[PDB]
Amino acid sequence: HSQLDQLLTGLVDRVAEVDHAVVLSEDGLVVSKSTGFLRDDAERLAATASGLMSLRQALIEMGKGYLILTAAGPGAHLVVLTRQGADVGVVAYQMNMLVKKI
Template sequence: MNDHMANERGWMLDEVLKVPEARHAILLSADGMLRAHSQGIGRDEAERQAAALSGLQSISRSTVEFCTIQDSPWRQTLVEFADGYVFLVAAGPGAYLAVSAGQAVDMEAVSYRMQKLVDRLGKELTAPPRQDVGTPT
């Protein structure tokens, strides 16, 4: 996939970055494939982060019993660093939206914009399960 194809939806992700201190946004599939990235992050870095964030989501989801007795669906993971945050939210079946932000970001504003983007785009942000890429057509 060339960068133009990977970034077909990139402009939509740029909307989330209008919050001051928001840095980068990527859309990824559950299996860690990059679906789109915001303008300020290169494709190689976005692909590396998509793979890492897929693992983070999987680990987060596996801790549900620590929070509740019932099987509760995963909604969001927030990671805090000394210099900022990474927000990771569900963006439809098999798709996740991740945003990085600086330390002074309005966390509520980022979460709100992310959810509004997911709501507004609906089907646009769904990523179907990855097909076997080795099968000849």
């Protein structure tokens, strides 16, 4: 488990609002994921995020919760899935602090 994997797993563990997290390369490759996020589920999130960016940041609210995406430097994006009713401000702050730590 890489340092980035531990950071992502740490975000998910500490933040009640955050269910899963991945970091995707410019090409859509999963570079890192929270350790309790299965490869099938992570790549499903990756396929969604890559579709989003074919259509920098994005925030999509649904019934489920939110999908939030932000830049993690010029070559990658951090992508998070929240639980239902999460405070977006809290999650965005946590993600911004994570990107800083990387």
